[PDB]
Amino acid sequence: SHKAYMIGAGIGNLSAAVYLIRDGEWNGEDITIMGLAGFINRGGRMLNEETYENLWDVLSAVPSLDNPGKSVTDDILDFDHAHPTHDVARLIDRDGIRNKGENDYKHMQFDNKDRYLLTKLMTMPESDEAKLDDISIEQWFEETPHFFTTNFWYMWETTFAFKRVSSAMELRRYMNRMILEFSRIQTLAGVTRSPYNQYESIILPMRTFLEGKGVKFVNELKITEFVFKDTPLRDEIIVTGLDYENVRTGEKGRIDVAEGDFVFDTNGSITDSSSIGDLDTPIVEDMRYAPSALLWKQATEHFYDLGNPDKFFGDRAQSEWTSFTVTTSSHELINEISRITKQLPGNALNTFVDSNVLLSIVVHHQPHYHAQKENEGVFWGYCLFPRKDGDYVKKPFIEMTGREMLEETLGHLEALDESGTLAARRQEIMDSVVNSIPSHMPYASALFNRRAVGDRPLVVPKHSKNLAFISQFAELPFDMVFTEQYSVRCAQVAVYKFLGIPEDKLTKMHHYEKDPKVLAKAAVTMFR
């Protein structure tokens, strides 16, 4: 019987397994998936019910582990509909919340130059994307630096963790795929949240369902090299073996990939080489090159049409940022944040636009984890300039302990709090801390690095017989690479191609950017 081998266990390969089982009528036994106090916020943070067509469809076949008779899609949408989002303190500067006045976050704050360039970028056809090769956002708006002082830039860069040195291609894809969210970017009312963090709300329901269908899960094997069959013209990609190392025993070997078996590789991950600290210990930067990209980099030693992984994993300056998760033993700290920001938990992130490190925090709906106790509260924060000094803790953010990161956050919170109450309650706040876990990710935004078309392999390269790339570093049209939808889409493309399902059966994506009314509203929104 035909077999499938997944290298990486993220949502992309899991969705491939789902597609194989549901639409290809495979047996789970034929699929092998190979991966490797206080909470840590792992996983994707957003979704969008108007987009993510593939994700909702895959997740409509995974049962909820919490609610009998509900699919994971049902869980997620039922929750979100009952917890609508309206960000209030989206932007916070040294004077207060940009809720009102001249800097009101309803104002994009665009030039006429800013709208001209932004409209040119937005209206460039998909077929012309290569014209943007290696052009950063900084470069495309080189003539109008005023852009990088607007509300829109502050909101857009922090919403997705984009840098100005990053690829202008995605900003274009945003303005087309996410066009509907343009008019509501400041309230983030279009964001769709799952009840808990997505590892618990999405990943484990998926693994459980797959495990129940027979899929084999392996986590001791480091796949070390592809083994390709040679051909006279050397175009075809035919994987014949997977060289492995067992990281616990030390055994090495080769798994034979027979004729009719398929291989799914996740060529790179935004969490590769990440490291962790705790309340009193700063991170130690893992200097190793992205381990999940090594199979990819090695295949380029044999084939010429597979891209340049160094574009994505060779420039940490483009890709790195740092986050942290706070756990408290009482609701007090969350109550204080909720009061100072004029916002109930679960209403999207709050960005301190005048902070030196560009710090944002997110307070989720509580609880965010299944093992969260009734008395416990959790929130999450990150900065986009981890090398810069903190405003209140005057050392580089990336060198801070988890405590120091909270202290730097409180400083900004206290600065916005006129009552002075939070600062007064400092000792009690800190005593309530279970942990504050810093989390450094050198490739966190590597999927946004400056890129040229062709720097990423096709999901199924033009002459690949049985190798597919399912990742945020494979080439797919239209979709935003930030979204979990991207990897789910790669999976359907790969599975349907390998199985012979024609592309008109692929899941149909919404094209709001060709509805004239949508464009009209988008055009008007430019002047808001």
Return the active site residues: 174
User: If you ran DSSP here, which 8-state letter would residue 201 be given?
Assistant: I
Residue 49 or 74 having the CB closest to Mg ion: 49
Residue 78 or 225 having the CB closest to Mg ion: 78
- CB closest to Mg ion, residue no: 49
Q: With CB under 5 A, what is the number of residues at the site for Mg ion?
A: 1
Residue 80 or 376 having the CB closest to Mg ion: 80
- DSSP character string of 172-189: HHHHHHTHHHHTTTTTTT
Residue 66 or 78 having the CB closest to Mg ion: 78
Secondary structure of residue 364 in the 3-state scheme: coil
Tell me the window of 42-50, 51-59, 245-253, 388-396 that interacts with Mg ion (CB under 5 A).
42-50
Residue 49 or 278 having the CB closest to Mg ion: 49
Site for Mg ion in 258-287 (CB under 5 A): none
Stretch 481-520: interaction string toward Mg ion, x if CB under 5 A: ----------------------------------------
Task: Choose among 47, 38, 40: nearest CA to 11.
Answer: 47
- Shortest Å, Cβ 193 to Mg ion: 9
Stretch 49-88: interaction string toward Mg ion, x if CB under 5 A: x---------------------------------------
- Shortest Å, Cβ 201 to Mg ion: 16
Bridge partners, 244 (sequence order) = 223, 253
* Main-chain phi, psi angles of 237, to 5 degrees: -105, 110
Whole-number Å distance between alpha carbons of 123 and 119 = 6
Tell me the window of 41-49, 157-165, 294-302, 331-339 that interacts with Mg ion (CB under 5 A).
41-49
Long-range contacts of 135-140 (CB under 8 A, 24+ apart): 135/167, 135/168, 135/169, 135/450, 136/164, 136/165, 136/166, 136/167, 136/168, 136/450, 137/162, 137/163, 137/164, 137/165, 137/166, 137/167, 137/168, 137/171, 138/164, 138/165, 139/168, 140/168, 140/171
- From start to end of 220-348, where are the E strands? 221-228, 239-246, 252-256, 262-265, 275-276, 321-328
> Which residues are near Mg ion by CB under 5 A?
49
